[PDB]
Amino acid sequence: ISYSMPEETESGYLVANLAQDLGLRVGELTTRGARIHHNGNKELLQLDAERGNLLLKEKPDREALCGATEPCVLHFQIILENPVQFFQTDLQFTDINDHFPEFPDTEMLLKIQEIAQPGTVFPLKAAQDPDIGSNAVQNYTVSPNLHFHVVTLSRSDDRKYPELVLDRALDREEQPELTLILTALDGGAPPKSGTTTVRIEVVDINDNAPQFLQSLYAVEVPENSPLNALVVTVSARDLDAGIHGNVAYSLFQGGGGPQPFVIDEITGEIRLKGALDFEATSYYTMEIVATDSGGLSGKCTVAIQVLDVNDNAPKLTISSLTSSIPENAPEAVVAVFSVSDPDSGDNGRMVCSIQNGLPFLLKPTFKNFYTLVTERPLDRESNAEYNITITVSDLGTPRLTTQHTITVQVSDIN
Amino acid sequence: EAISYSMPEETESGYLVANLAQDLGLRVGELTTRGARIHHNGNKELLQLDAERGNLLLKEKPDREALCGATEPCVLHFQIILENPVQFFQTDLQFTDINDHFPEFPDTEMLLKIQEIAQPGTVFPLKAAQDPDIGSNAVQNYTVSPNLHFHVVTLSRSDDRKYPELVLDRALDREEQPELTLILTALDGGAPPKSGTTTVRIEVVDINDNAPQFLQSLYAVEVPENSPLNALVVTVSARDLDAGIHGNVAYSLFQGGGGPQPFVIDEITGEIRLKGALDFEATSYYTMEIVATDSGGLSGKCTVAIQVLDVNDNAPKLTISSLTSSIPENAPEAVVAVFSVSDPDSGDNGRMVCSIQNGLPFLLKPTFKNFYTLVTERPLDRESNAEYNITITVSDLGTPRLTTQHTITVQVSDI
Numbered sequence A: 001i002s003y004s005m006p007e008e009t010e011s012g013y014l015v016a017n018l019a020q021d022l023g024l025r026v027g028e029l030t031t032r033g034a035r036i037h038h039n040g041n042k043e044l045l046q047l048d049a050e051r052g053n054l055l056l057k058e059k060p061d062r063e064a065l066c067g068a069t070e071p072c073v074l075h076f077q078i079i080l081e082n083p084v085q086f087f088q089t090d091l092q093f094t095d096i097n098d099h100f101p102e103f104p105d106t107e108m109l110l111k112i113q114e115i116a117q118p119g120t121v122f123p124l125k126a127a128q129d130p131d132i133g134s135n136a137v138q139n140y141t142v143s144p145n146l147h148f149h150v151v152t153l154s155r156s157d158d159r160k161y162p163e164l165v166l167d168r169a170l171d172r173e174e175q176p177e178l179t180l181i182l183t184a185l186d187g188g189a190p191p192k193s194g195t196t197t198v199r200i201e202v203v204d205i206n207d208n209a210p211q212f213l214q215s216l217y218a219v220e221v222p223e224n225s226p227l228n229a230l231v232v233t234v235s236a237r238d239l240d241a242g243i244h245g246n247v248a249y250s251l252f253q254g255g256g257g258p259q260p261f262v263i264d265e266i267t268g269e270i271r272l273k274g275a276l277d278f279e280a281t282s283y284y285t286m287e288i289v290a291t292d293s294g295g296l297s298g299k300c301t302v303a304i305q306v307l308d309v310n311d312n313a314p315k316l317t318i319s320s321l322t323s324s325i326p327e328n329a330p331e332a333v334v335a336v337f338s339v340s341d342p343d344s345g346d347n348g349r350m351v352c353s354i355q356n357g358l359p360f361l362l363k364p365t366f367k368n369f370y371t372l373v374t375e376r377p378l379d380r381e382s383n384a385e386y387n388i389t390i391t392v393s394d395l396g397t398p399r400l401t402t403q404h405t406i407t408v409q410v411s412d413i414n
Numbered sequence B: 001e002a003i004s005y006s007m008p009e010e011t012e013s014g015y016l017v018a019n020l021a022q023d024l025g026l027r028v029g030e031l032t033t034r035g036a037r038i039h040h041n042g043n044k045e046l047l048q049l050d051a052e053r054g055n056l057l058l059k060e061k062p063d064r065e066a067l068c069g070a071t072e073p074c075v076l077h078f079q080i081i082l083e084n085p086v087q088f089f090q091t092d093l094q095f096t097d098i099n100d101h102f103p104e105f106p107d108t109e110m111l112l113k114i115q116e117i118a119q120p121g122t123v124f125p126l127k128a129a130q131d132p133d134i135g136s137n138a139v140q141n142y143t144v145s146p147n148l149h150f151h152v153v154t155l156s157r158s159d160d161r162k163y164p165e166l167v168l169d170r171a172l173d174r175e176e177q178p179e180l181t182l183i184l185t186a187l188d189g190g191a192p193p194k195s196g197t198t199t200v201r202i203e204v205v206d207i208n209d210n211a212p213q214f215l216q217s218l219y220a221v222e223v224p225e226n227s228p229l230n231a232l233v234v235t236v237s238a239r240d241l242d243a244g245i246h247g248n249v250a251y252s253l254f255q256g257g258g259g260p261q262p263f264v265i266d267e268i269t270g271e272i273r274l275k276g277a278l279d280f281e282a283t284s285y286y287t288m289e290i291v292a293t294d295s296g297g298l299s300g301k302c303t304v305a306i307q308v309l310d311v312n313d314n315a316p317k318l319t320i321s322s323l324t325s326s327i328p329e330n331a332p333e334a335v336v337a338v339f340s341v342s343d344p345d346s347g348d349n350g351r352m353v354c355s356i357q358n359g360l361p362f363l364l365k366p367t368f369k370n371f372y373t374l375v376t377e378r379p380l381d382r383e384s385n386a387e388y389n390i391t392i393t394v395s396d397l398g399t400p401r402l403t404t405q406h407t408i409t410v411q412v413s414d415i
């Protein structure tokens, strides 16, 4: 004979009316010297022989008695002596939902990279439940968010294990860290729950390119500026963090000609490497390029205009027509000369002068092109030779003067 | 107006610039009669005057880049003077640039570090080639050595200067081709064109685009019940196609939703060790899942099934319930006692047999499964023996064999 009864029933519960089930008289139970025999460690059942009833001595717990084995049936044998008779009886215990779903870890750590595409699965630790069947784990739900959703798998021996599925791509630049609530629901009535915290750490991915604060840099620097002069400092910013955010500055020269400028890849400072000359090159158009450790780059145009400095003296060049000059020759051209100046503005503008005492005349024929002509015929006895010191001088600040001497002799017939 | 003569660069000295006498409309004798002379700003005479044949010649070879450079046009303003009578003429000499310079790149080798997940259409700035020439004689085109992942584009800017930029058309893969080498060539527009090559070495940056994979899809291992605590069961290894911090793997143990399991995993080596005690009579079969995870989130999973082995570590449990301490003399078929045997083990380790002495006139009769009875085989007088000893000996059929015995003394009555 076999009897069935729910788990965790209070001790002293009336199991079965043994007297009626055996079809024997009430006094016969104590008459035959009814005893109970079993190899169990604990005597779960005590026999009331006077009323012929089978009673529980202690409160049973299925998980501690059977555990994983199902059905939980305990076999024992009751013996009678008058006459000698044996009766094997089995007792089955129906499992109840008296266990709450418990997660292994109080928090689960997930480090998901930013470029993780939707549909990507992530394994989660399952909630365990010592119960059996519908009283065990049945459902898994995740706290309402816009990124993930959990799905339950009944793989293998019908043991349910949850895994998290991504639906919308992550972004560390928007939300660095996620915190979800993983809830496990039982299939019993009423259902039992078990909650844990899913900690999602979004790993940074270099998906952002560095950009300069200014698209154009325009700075003026004098020609006579000292070596290692701070021309301009350039700054670029990256939206990413760590090594993925570090930038490296590189100088791209424009067209031909050497660039006397150097950039620091770290600080972003542009400084003088060589010499500057407004007369050689007055305007530089270059491009600074900041690049991360990934290859993503940003570019900016830097324009540097050199300032003019009066550091050039006028170049006086003279070609003589007549080494000697007749006495009674009116209006004679002694020599013709031209002046030069690479500078600009008043630094390039130049006025030339001659001694006022000399009977000669400077006649400006062409632009920066003068002629030295005698103003009147000359006698020999007065002055044999003449030292004419032409002095060309610019109108800049400071003023630079260049002068040259020519000797002209007046001569009649030999 | 003033007169101007044009002449290509790098012309050999002694070149016939122009018939100056005819251009000025003067007689052949008149030019040398008036003492025609040449005046220019430079000390170095670039021009020399031939008053005999009335021609203008070159005294030095002109270099446009050394005279003008970037300025255009390269015009030298010079003057011609006459002395019979005194007269002044303005004349200009323009030097047409010639394609006499090779395009050169500043650096012999340019290093690029491009990500593996770089999307097509991504631009990568490259340093331009230098050319002191002007117009069509400067840098005009940019071509890149035949590859599969890149193509160069020639862009113009500001003063219509040409600069190259590299364009990706096919995504890279460090697991396929870690490093790439290109030849960047710059082509002139002159005739014939002139090239300028340089190394462009592209180093593919690693991106975590590989998930860890287990060598085996299933792991099976037998472990004895008597095995010690914290003993290495099996070592699992997973490989990652990536490298560096994107390649190192961390192992995690995932158990079933049934009950607690006595096992632990090493994150580095991948060794599974025992955590608690093992008993075949408790839990016989274990199914766990090992999950390998990198530093990016990409994972791989393998199923590890371990069944424990049964050992004969449980002696049979004998429990005897006696009915009669004393027995009648001439009583046939008398039931002395009734006992039960147990064995939690399985197979021959659980199978058990019971024995009694051969000299005793008692018979051991089986009534129920693993449940026997001690009954007299035949009546017997007292004068032979007053009391008898019955040592029930129960033993399993395992290896080694475990035995357990217990004695019961029974007396006869009625004299």
Ligand SMILES: *[C@@H]1O[C@H](CO[C@@H]2O[C@@H](C)[C@@H](O)[C@@H](O)[C@@H]2O)[C@@H](O[C@@H]2O[C@H](CO)[C@@H](O[C@@H]3O[C@H](CO[C@H]4O[C@H](CO)[C@@H](O[C@@H]5O[C@H](CO)[C@@H](O)[C@H](O)[C@H]5NC(C)=O)[C@H](O)[C@@H]4O)[C@@H](O)[C@H](O[C@H]4O[C@H](CO)[C@@H](O[C@@H]5O[C@H](CO)[C@@H](O[C@@H]6O[C@H](CO)[C@H](O)[C@H](O)[C@H]6O)[C@H](O)[C@H]5NC(C)=O)[C@H](O)[C@@H]4O)[C@@H]3O)[C@H](O)[C@H]2NC(C)=O)[C@H](O)[C@H]1NC(C)=O
Pocket: B387, B388, B389, B407, B409
């Ligand atoms: C069926 O099996 C039975 C069970 O056997 C058991 O299983 C086997 C495998 C063995 O493990 C065995 O040990 C188990 O018991 C058998 O029953 C038992 O049988 C044994 C032996 O047959 C009885 O003796 C017991 O064992 C000791 C024997 O010692 C042996 O070794 C030594 C040294 O090798 C050797 O000693 C030498 O003996 C000779 C001869 O005397 C001497 O000349 C030598 O000098 C001496 N050597 C030296 C160095 O000195 C022996 O020859 C053996 O080989 C024995 O010592 C031991 O004695 C103690 O333990 C018992 C415990 O029961 C005590 O008995 C109780 O004492 C109480 C106190 O006086 C007494 O109370 C009195 O009660 C009465 C009324 O009842 C009155 O009221 C008084 O006022 C009270 O004081 C109790 O009544 C008494 N118990 C009984 C039942 O009467 C004893 O005093 C002492 O403390 C021990 O006796 C053994 O007794 C016996 N078991 C029982 C319960 O009786 C049975 O024999 C088998 N069947 C057959 C047919 O054989």
Ligand SMILES: *[C@@H]1O[C@H](CO[C@@H]2O[C@@H](C)[C@@H](O)[C@@H](O)[C@@H]2O)[C@@H](O)[C@H](O)[C@H]1NC(C)=O
Pocket: A138, A139, A140, A141
């Ligand atoms: C598992 O649970 C899913 C989510 O149900 C939600 O949670 C419960 C506690 C209620 O608040 C309910 O209003 C929510 O929608 C269900 O969509 C799904 O069907 C369930 N699966 C099974 C097998 O029951």
Ligand SMILES: *[C@@H]1O[C@H](CO[C@@H]2O[C@@H](C)[C@@H](O)[C@@H](O)[C@@H]2O)[C@@H](O)[C@H](O)[C@H]1NC(C)=O
Pocket: A386, A387
């Ligand atoms: C005219 O100049 C002649 C040349 O002298 C030169 O110029 C002067 C300024 C010094 O620098 C001298 O060392 C040069 O050799 C003179 O010999 C002559 O006396 C000068 N005539 C007059 C009237 O001063």
Ligand SMILES: *[C@@H]1O[C@H](CO)[C@@H](O)[C@H](O)[C@H]1NC(C)=O
Pocket: B140, B141, B142, B143
């Ligand atoms: C440069 O060369 C390529 C290949 O020969 C050609 O397709 C392209 O039209 C050229 N560009 C110019 C501006 O000539």
Ligand SMILES: *[C@H]1O[C@H](CO)[C@@H](O)[C@H](O)[C@@H]1O
Pocket: A191, A192, A193, A194, A195
């Ligand atoms: C299980 O338990 C949780 C709270 O722990 C409830 O929110 C849920 O609805 C279910 O009752």
Ligand SMILES: *[C@H]1O[C@H](CO)[C@@H](O)[C@H](O)[C@@H]1O
Pocket: A181, A194, A195, A196, A197
């Ligand atoms: C599981 O999650 C619930 C969410 O309601 C918490 O209230 C609880 O403390 C446990 O963390």
Ligand SMILES: *[C@H]1O[C@H](CO)[C@@H](O)[C@H](O)[C@@H]1O
Pocket: A106, A107, A180, A181, A196, A197, A198
């Ligand atoms: C994660 O967060 C939940 C609430 O969101 C806690 O209840 C839990 O203990 C863990 O700290």
Ligand SMILES: *[C@H]1O[C@H](CO)[C@@H](O)[C@H](O)[C@@H]1O
Pocket: B185, B193, B194, B195, B196
């Ligand atoms: C560019 O092309 C010319 C031929 O047009 C080669 O001679 C030169 O070496 C470079 O490859």
Ligand SMILES: *[C@H]1O[C@H](CO)[C@@H](O)[C@H](O)[C@@H]1O
Pocket: B183, B196, B197, B198, B199
């Ligand atoms: C540029 O590259 C070409 C081909 O590698 C060489 O031949 C040339 O000398 C220059 O270095």
Ligand SMILES: *[C@H]1O[C@H](CO)[C@@H](O)[C@H](O)[C@@H]1O
Pocket: B108, B109, B181, B182, B183, B197, B198, B199, B200
């Ligand atoms: C880049 O190109 C140069 C030719 O200038 C080679 O020498 C070098 O090995 C790389 O291919």
Ligand SMILES: [Ca+2]
Pocket: A008, A061, A062, A063, A098, A099
């Ligand atoms: Ca329970």
Ligand SMILES: [Ca+2]
Pocket: A097, A098, A099, A100, A101, A129, A131, A135, A136, A137, A186, A192
């Ligand atoms: Ca439950």
Ligand SMILES: [Ca+2]
Pocket: A007, A062, A063, A095, A096, A097, A098, A099, A130, A131, A132, A135
């Ligand atoms: Ca339960």
Ligand SMILES: [Ca+2]
Pocket: A114, A171, A172, A173, A207, A208
């Ligand atoms: Ca982003």
Ligand SMILES: [Ca+2]
Pocket: A114, A172, A173, A204, A205, A206, A207, A208, A239, A240
């Ligand atoms: Ca990012």
Ligand SMILES: [Ca+2]
Pocket: A206, A207, A208, A209, A210, A238, A239, A240, A244, A245, A292, A294, A296
């Ligand atoms: Ca970046």
